[PDB]
């Protein structure tokens, strides 16, 4: 079978996805945004694809041919309307006799579903992909699905925002409807300053570059803040009052795979993911039921899902959002590390063979140990005081982890820092700015989690200011 | 315009060809032999092609995806008949709306010409490409063309060889009809040992891996040795009694570009190429006339040509062979370095626009200096005595050029050696075995040539035996 991948940023990381897919399938890669592709990613695409096509419109001089080492967000214009992007995807699938189409990138999810319908291939479903990609549509589907409902309003104007804040009250979440990675996600607690907070992220949002293929009913959604009740869920310290759960939709039925515990965010910037959750079986049953109702509520047919859930009072699961694609960072690789299951291969098996794929009957269990996937940010060193608080730029020499910081049998499997010499702008939104990553493993989850907090508070930044 | 390149070994090197082509054209690359592609070559193909297709039949496990750092000859099977290879090329050109097809590899020249005819694109010409690829057909075309003629016979059997040696006498050249790089090329001078010499290279030839797409009337050609008369041509020492000349056929007319001087071969293994020739204008007029008659005699329509010519008594040019593709090593890059002319771009301009291309009217001149492209071989150190004569293997630590060795204003532009640690088998045919490469430049050609001989005799090999 031949699988077409729409290659771009995010989701199951290139270091796993290409090799995984090429094991069992003939992979063809379509690159709609050549500029979104790093040098490492380009190498992996080249290595494992039997065929590769790039959008030739995004090559005007010989330097369009350059691949950066690192990309946190694609800044260049992509100006094709969604119908045109659909027609491209279709043309490429047809060129290669594709039996399935997949993507790891949030921004191409809606057009891909349209391409699959037109080709008679398995996909998210046209309206379902739109629901999984416009947070106002999504929140409407959730409210209808008999998970916990909350108040939410479409916001374009200061007038819209004013109305929303009056109707919803504080605390209020205001966020863009069409992005990812917590971009623009703001917590409103003060009616005195709320309107300035809006004006500010409004102006910010307009500086974010997205393809014209991305459309939305209103730029913002304002909705109730879902309050966490940590102590109603976790028995030990170390985690946060949200989780994610990774699943697969197959013919419109939800198949849970694994739940990830989290460490506390820096604002809304995510910090760490632990595979699998320490939560008891009843807690996990409730999360699974919520994710099922949410994703079936969206109408999704065949895709991976990454579903985020706030752990609220009375063990009520609150839906934050759900995507029709893989979790990012190393969450999917780490499921393979722990359980032996390759969810990338499993998705492709579903796209090609439906419920003939070997879907697990329930969450994976009998984990031999826990694995943490962790990023450090300028803020861990601002909060450490190693970076002076008022600094807009810095130059990175080294990042070191002092010894002694590990609890129990917790092991550091790997550690990677930003190269000596690297330049960091501190006006930047944090989630774009991890300057180190580490993987921990341990037999005891609470020990793993404590070690993450120790590594976080004590890591050593040597840096020219 | 869209150019399809059949990507494989030899010709205009990847470090020039892809970037050159992608400057002015939309490049699509077809890889019929994934195993023939080095890691550097793969990277260049990926960087400059808007689309890439590989033959998926040559991928059975995840390690078919590996690219070696270095390949001297493709060892793996390629089992498709020529008609099947033609049909592939056609299918790919049709997929991408190719306006032209080119290749740098000798072994795909015949099928490509067939694909171009069928598609109505410019090419070598079907029978002309066959003549440029079967040395018995080639030598027959040459004899007909009114360049100097010589005796030649088709050899398959010991009986055939015996007959050929009687009819031709010594000295005799016996060589495979369908290869390159002097593989199997043998000089016969002794009727006592001639039949054993045949039996030996017969058995050797059968161990050389070529695609099934390569066919030939007889495996061997035996033909008169063309005697050189150096002193009838060159006024100074430093060169050899053969040259090459690089040209372009456009609509069946020959356009000379540049003549390369050579340093003496190690047997028939080539050693160095100097851009451009020091030969006087009359000598160059005779070479050009010979190359014209030869390549027009072959019937070639639209292609690059690399034509090798023995400098014989009475300034008679002897045809050695001619290919319907670029010279290998850095001969084509070095023409650009000296004259500013990019022959890769010029070939593509001819394939797409015919004689509307900006073809020079005669050999390029007003060279600002001479550039030498030079390889060192185990033999330069065997002959130096730095490698003991009876050694079948070695391990390379370093290769050094002592200072003092440069004549006049000759400069070393660049120097590259085999990595410390590299392993070298000395049973191997020499042309496969360069362990260092250097580029010289100088204002005075005879000084450049002398410096090459000094570097050759005195270079320092540090090596574990
Ligand atoms: N209604 C909400 N209540 C509480 N937290 C929220 C809410 N909406 C978003 N968040 C927080 O902001 C983060 C990012 O918002 P999310 O809706 O997941 O958008 P994104 O697609 O940018 O990741 C979430 O992981 C969650 O911590
Ligand atoms: N008839 C010949 N007379 C003299 N030298 C020859 C003859 N044939 C081949 N050679 C020598 O052998 C080398 C390689 O042979 P050639 O015919 O060019 O085949 P290849 O395609 O292997 O390079 C030539 O560069 C030339 O030096
Ligand atoms: Mg999201
Ligand atoms: Mg999210
Ligand atoms: Mg040859
Ligand atoms: Mg030759």
PDB file of N, CA and C in Angstrom, chain A residues 2 19-20 22-23 26 31 42-43 46-56 59 62 65-67 91 95-96, chain B residues 2 19-20 22-23 26 31 42-43 46-56 59 62 65-67 91 95-96:
ATOM      1  N   UNK A   2       0.327   2.348  -0.576  1.00  0.00           N
ATOM      2  CA  UNK A   2       1.024   3.634  -0.732  1.00  0.00           C
ATOM      3  C   UNK A   2       0.301   4.679   0.135  1.00  0.00           C
ATOM      4  N   UNK A  19      10.299   6.565   9.493  1.00  0.00           N
ATOM      5  CA  UNK A  19      10.873   5.241   9.570  1.00  0.00           C
ATOM      6  C   UNK A  19       9.774   4.253   9.891  1.00  0.00           C
ATOM      7  N   UNK A  20       8.902   4.636  10.817  1.00  0.00           N
ATOM      8  CA  UNK A  20       7.714   3.827  11.132  1.00  0.00           C
ATOM      9  C   UNK A  20       6.838   3.509   9.915  1.00  0.00           C
ATOM     10  N   UNK A  22       7.610   3.756   6.705  1.00  0.00           N
ATOM     11  CA  UNK A  22       8.329   3.130   5.573  1.00  0.00           C
ATOM     12  C   UNK A  22       8.608   1.667   5.818  1.00  0.00           C
ATOM     13  N   UNK A  23       8.509   1.257   7.081  1.00  0.00           N
ATOM     14  CA  UNK A  23       8.629  -0.148   7.436  1.00  0.00           C
ATOM     15  C   UNK A  23       7.591  -0.997   6.727  1.00  0.00           C
ATOM     16  N   UNK A  26       4.656   1.993   1.349  1.00  0.00           N
ATOM     17  CA  UNK A  26       5.356   2.862   0.422  1.00  0.00           C
ATOM     18  C   UNK A  26       4.933   4.312   0.641  1.00  0.00           C
ATOM     19  N   UNK A  31       5.111  18.195   0.142  1.00  0.00           N
ATOM     20  CA  UNK A  31       5.578  19.341   0.928  1.00  0.00           C
ATOM     21  C   UNK A  31       4.932  20.637   0.427  1.00  0.00           C
ATOM     22  N   UNK A  42      14.036  17.342   6.383  1.00  0.00           N
ATOM     23  CA  UNK A  42      14.251  17.150   4.955  1.00  0.00           C
ATOM     24  C   UNK A  42      15.025  15.857   4.694  1.00  0.00           C
ATOM     25  N   UNK A  43      16.018  15.598   5.521  1.00  0.00           N
ATOM     26  CA  UNK A  43      16.825  14.393   5.402  1.00  0.00           C
ATOM     27  C   UNK A  43      15.999  13.119   5.634  1.00  0.00           C
ATOM     28  N   UNK A  46      13.630  12.535   2.723  1.00  0.00           N
ATOM     29  CA  UNK A  46      14.418  12.024   1.574  1.00  0.00           C
ATOM     30  C   UNK A  46      14.749  10.564   1.794  1.00  0.00           C
ATOM     31  N   UNK A  47      15.103  10.209   3.028  1.00  0.00           N
ATOM     32  CA  UNK A  47      15.585   8.864   3.312  1.00  0.00           C
ATOM     33  C   UNK A  47      14.495   7.807   3.164  1.00  0.00           C
ATOM     34  N   UNK A  48      13.277   8.126   3.598  1.00  0.00           N
ATOM     35  CA  UNK A  48      12.246   7.086   3.738  1.00  0.00           C
ATOM     36  C   UNK A  48      11.121   7.157   2.703  1.00  0.00           C
ATOM     37  N   UNK A  49      11.085   8.213   1.900  1.00  0.00           N
ATOM     38  CA  UNK A  49      10.084   8.310   0.865  1.00  0.00           C
ATOM     39  C   UNK A  49      10.530   7.721  -0.454  1.00  0.00           C
ATOM     40  N   UNK A  50       9.639   6.979  -1.095  1.00  0.00           N
ATOM     41  CA  UNK A  50       9.905   6.475  -2.419  1.00  0.00           C
ATOM     42  C   UNK A  50       9.722   7.583  -3.473  1.00  0.00           C
ATOM     43  N   UNK A  51       8.881   8.575  -3.150  1.00  0.00           N
ATOM     44  CA  UNK A  51       8.689   9.759  -3.948  1.00  0.00           C
ATOM     45  C   UNK A  51       8.405  10.990  -3.089  1.00  0.00           C
ATOM     46  N   UNK A  52       8.866  12.131  -3.575  1.00  0.00           N
ATOM     47  CA  UNK A  52       8.729  13.412  -2.880  1.00  0.00           C
ATOM     48  C   UNK A  52       8.296  14.459  -3.906  1.00  0.00           C
ATOM     49  N   UNK A  53       7.265  15.238  -3.577  1.00  0.00           N
ATOM     50  CA  UNK A  53       6.904  16.424  -4.391  1.00  0.00           C
ATOM     51  C   UNK A  53       6.799  17.675  -3.531  1.00  0.00           C
ATOM     52  N   UNK A  54       7.431  18.755  -3.982  1.00  0.00           N
ATOM     53  CA  UNK A  54       7.320  20.061  -3.329  1.00  0.00           C
ATOM     54  C   UNK A  54       6.424  21.030  -4.130  1.00  0.00           C
ATOM     55  N   UNK A  55       5.791  21.961  -3.440  1.00  0.00           N
ATOM     56  CA  UNK A  55       5.068  22.998  -4.132  1.00  0.00           C
ATOM     57  C   UNK A  55       6.113  23.873  -4.793  1.00  0.00           C
ATOM     58  N   UNK A  56       6.178  23.850  -6.112  1.00  0.00           N
ATOM     59  CA  UNK A  56       7.199  24.650  -6.822  1.00  0.00           C
ATOM     60  C   UNK A  56       6.992  26.188  -6.802  1.00  0.00           C
ATOM     61  N   UNK A  59       9.616  28.516  -4.576  1.00  0.00           N
ATOM     62  CA  UNK A  59      11.052  28.522  -4.991  1.00  0.00           C
ATOM     63  C   UNK A  59      11.348  29.639  -6.055  1.00  0.00           C
ATOM     64  N   UNK A  62      17.853  30.589  -5.490  1.00  0.00           N
ATOM     65  CA  UNK A  62      18.576  29.408  -5.043  1.00  0.00           C
ATOM     66  C   UNK A  62      18.536  29.249  -3.505  1.00  0.00           C
ATOM     67  N   UNK A  65      16.093  27.121  -1.563  1.00  0.00           N
ATOM     68  CA  UNK A  65      16.530  25.727  -1.407  1.00  0.00           C
ATOM     69  C   UNK A  65      17.186  25.433  -0.029  1.00  0.00           C
ATOM     70  N   UNK A  66      17.469  26.466   0.756  1.00  0.00           N
ATOM     71  CA  UNK A  66      18.121  26.285   2.066  1.00  0.00           C
ATOM     72  C   UNK A  66      17.124  25.756   3.095  1.00  0.00           C
ATOM     73  N   UNK A  67      17.564  24.829   3.953  1.00  0.00           N
ATOM     74  CA  UNK A  67      16.750  24.367   5.098  1.00  0.00           C
ATOM     75  C   UNK A  67      17.375  24.871   6.393  1.00  0.00           C
ATOM     76  N   UNK A  91      -4.435  15.885  -6.601  1.00  0.00           N
ATOM     77  CA  UNK A  91      -3.596  15.675  -7.797  1.00  0.00           C
ATOM     78  C   UNK A  91      -2.415  14.754  -7.447  1.00  0.00           C
ATOM     79  N   UNK A  95      -1.564  11.062  -8.780  1.00  0.00           N
ATOM     80  CA  UNK A  95      -0.248  10.792  -9.450  1.00  0.00           C
ATOM     81  C   UNK A  95       0.376   9.466  -8.970  1.00  0.00           C
ATOM     82  N   UNK A  96       0.182   9.158  -7.686  1.00  0.00           N
ATOM     83  CA  UNK A  96       0.876   8.051  -7.026  1.00  0.00           C
ATOM     84  C   UNK A  96       0.023   6.889  -6.577  1.00  0.00           C
TER      85      UNK A  96
ATOM     86  N   UNK B   2      10.649  22.235 -17.255  1.00  0.00           N
ATOM     87  CA  UNK B   2      10.877  21.127 -16.314  1.00  0.00           C
ATOM     88  C   UNK B   2      11.844  20.129 -16.973  1.00  0.00           C
ATOM     89  N   UNK B  19      22.673  22.263  -8.651  1.00  0.00           N
ATOM     90  CA  UNK B  19      22.535  23.672  -8.357  1.00  0.00           C
ATOM     91  C   UNK B  19      22.477  24.436  -9.661  1.00  0.00           C
ATOM     92  N   UNK B  20      23.335  24.051 -10.597  1.00  0.00           N
ATOM     93  CA  UNK B  20      23.299  24.623 -11.952  1.00  0.00           C
ATOM     94  C   UNK B  20      21.933  24.508 -12.639  1.00  0.00           C
ATOM     95  N   UNK B  22      18.993  23.843 -11.269  1.00  0.00           N
ATOM     96  CA  UNK B  22      17.861  24.389 -10.488  1.00  0.00           C
ATOM     97  C   UNK B  22      17.815  25.897 -10.535  1.00  0.00           C
ATOM     98  N   UNK B  23      18.931  26.503 -10.935  1.00  0.00           N
ATOM     99  CA  UNK B  23      18.981  27.941 -11.145  1.00  0.00           C
ATOM    100  C   UNK B  23      17.967  28.394 -12.178  1.00  0.00           C
ATOM    101  N   UNK B  26      13.026  23.884 -13.487  1.00  0.00           N
ATOM    102  CA  UNK B  26      12.418  23.032 -12.482  1.00  0.00           C
ATOM    103  C   UNK B  26      12.890  21.592 -12.659  1.00  0.00           C
ATOM    104  N   UNK B  31      15.481   8.244  -9.810  1.00  0.00           N
ATOM    105  CA  UNK B  31      16.555   7.395  -9.286  1.00  0.00           C
ATOM    106  C   UNK B  31      16.268   5.919  -9.578  1.00  0.00           C
ATOM    107  N   UNK B  42      22.549  12.183  -2.472  1.00  0.00           N
ATOM    108  CA  UNK B  42      21.158  12.149  -2.043  1.00  0.00           C
ATOM    109  C   UNK B  42      20.729  13.508  -1.490  1.00  0.00           C
ATOM    110  N   UNK B  43      21.606  14.128  -0.728  1.00  0.00           N
ATOM    111  CA  UNK B  43      21.338  15.437  -0.152  1.00  0.00           C
ATOM    112  C   UNK B  43      21.169  16.519  -1.229  1.00  0.00           C
ATOM    113  N   UNK B  46      17.903  16.016  -3.101  1.00  0.00           N
ATOM    114  CA  UNK B  46      16.789  16.464  -2.229  1.00  0.00           C
ATOM    115  C   UNK B  46      16.727  17.976  -2.221  1.00  0.00           C
ATOM    116  N   UNK B  47      17.889  18.623  -2.167  1.00  0.00           N
ATOM    117  CA  UNK B  47      17.935  20.070  -2.004  1.00  0.00           C
ATOM    118  C   UNK B  47      17.410  20.816  -3.227  1.00  0.00           C
ATOM    119  N   UNK B  48      17.732  20.323  -4.422  1.00  0.00           N
ATOM    120  CA  UNK B  48      17.496  21.119  -5.637  1.00  0.00           C
ATOM    121  C   UNK B  48      16.357  20.611  -6.524  1.00  0.00           C
ATOM    122  N   UNK B  49      15.809  19.441  -6.218  1.00  0.00           N
ATOM    123  CA  UNK B  49      14.693  18.936  -6.979  1.00  0.00           C
ATOM    124  C   UNK B  49      13.351  19.352  -6.421  1.00  0.00           C
ATOM    125  N   UNK B  50      12.447  19.748  -7.305  1.00  0.00           N
ATOM    126  CA  UNK B  50      11.094  20.042  -6.903  1.00  0.00           C
ATOM    127  C   UNK B  50      10.293  18.745  -6.684  1.00  0.00           C
ATOM    128  N   UNK B  51      10.708  17.670  -7.369  1.00  0.00           N
ATOM    129  CA  UNK B  51      10.170  16.345  -7.191  1.00  0.00           C
ATOM    130  C   UNK B  51      11.231  15.264  -7.390  1.00  0.00           C
ATOM    131  N   UNK B  52      11.076  14.182  -6.644  1.00  0.00           N
ATOM    132  CA  UNK B  52      12.010  13.055  -6.663  1.00  0.00           C
ATOM    133  C   UNK B  52      11.189  11.766  -6.701  1.00  0.00           C
ATOM    134  N   UNK B  53      11.536  10.855  -7.611  1.00  0.00           N
ATOM    135  CA  UNK B  53      10.960   9.488  -7.592  1.00  0.00           C
ATOM    136  C   UNK B  53      12.052   8.428  -7.615  1.00  0.00           C
ATOM    137  N   UNK B  54      11.940   7.448  -6.722  1.00  0.00           N
ATOM    138  CA  UNK B  54      12.842   6.294  -6.704  1.00  0.00           C
ATOM    139  C   UNK B  54      12.158   5.021  -7.244  1.00  0.00           C
ATOM    140  N   UNK B  55      12.942   4.119  -7.806  1.00  0.00           N
ATOM    141  CA  UNK B  55      12.402   2.838  -8.186  1.00  0.00           C
ATOM    142  C   UNK B  55      12.099   2.106  -6.894  1.00  0.00           C
ATOM    143  N   UNK B  56      10.829   1.897  -6.600  1.00  0.00           N
ATOM    144  CA  UNK B  56      10.460   1.222  -5.336  1.00  0.00           C
ATOM    145  C   UNK B  56      10.788  -0.292  -5.253  1.00  0.00           C
ATOM    146  N   UNK B  59      13.811  -1.530  -2.685  1.00  0.00           N
ATOM    147  CA  UNK B  59      13.608  -1.298  -1.222  1.00  0.00           C
ATOM    148  C   UNK B  59      12.867  -2.501  -0.537  1.00  0.00           C
ATOM    149  N   UNK B  62      14.516  -1.877   5.821  1.00  0.00           N
ATOM    150  CA  UNK B  62      14.789  -0.504   6.219  1.00  0.00           C
ATOM    151  C   UNK B  62      16.233  -0.074   5.874  1.00  0.00           C
ATOM    152  N   UNK B  65      17.306   1.790   2.768  1.00  0.00           N
ATOM    153  CA  UNK B  65      17.210   3.250   2.902  1.00  0.00           C
ATOM    154  C   UNK B  65      18.567   3.932   3.233  1.00  0.00           C
ATOM    155  N   UNK B  66      19.591   3.151   3.557  1.00  0.00           N
ATOM    156  CA  UNK B  66      20.906   3.712   3.917  1.00  0.00           C
ATOM    157  C   UNK B  66      21.647   4.192   2.671  1.00  0.00           C
ATOM    158  N   UNK B  67      22.332   5.336   2.769  1.00  0.00           N
ATOM    159  CA  UNK B  67      23.224   5.813   1.690  1.00  0.00           C
ATOM    160  C   UNK B  67      24.672   5.709   2.154  1.00  0.00           C
ATOM    161  N   UNK B  91       7.147   7.102 -18.246  1.00  0.00           N
ATOM    162  CA  UNK B  91       6.062   7.265 -17.259  1.00  0.00           C
ATOM    163  C   UNK B  91       6.360   8.471 -16.354  1.00  0.00           C
ATOM    164  N   UNK B  95       4.379  11.945 -15.980  1.00  0.00           N
ATOM    165  CA  UNK B  95       3.854  12.368 -14.639  1.00  0.00           C
ATOM    166  C   UNK B  95       4.112  13.864 -14.369  1.00  0.00           C
ATOM    167  N   UNK B  96       5.257  14.356 -14.846  1.00  0.00           N
ATOM    168  CA  UNK B  96       5.747  15.692 -14.500  1.00  0.00           C
ATOM    169  C   UNK B  96       5.809  16.700 -15.622  1.00  0.00           C
TER     170      UNK B  96
END
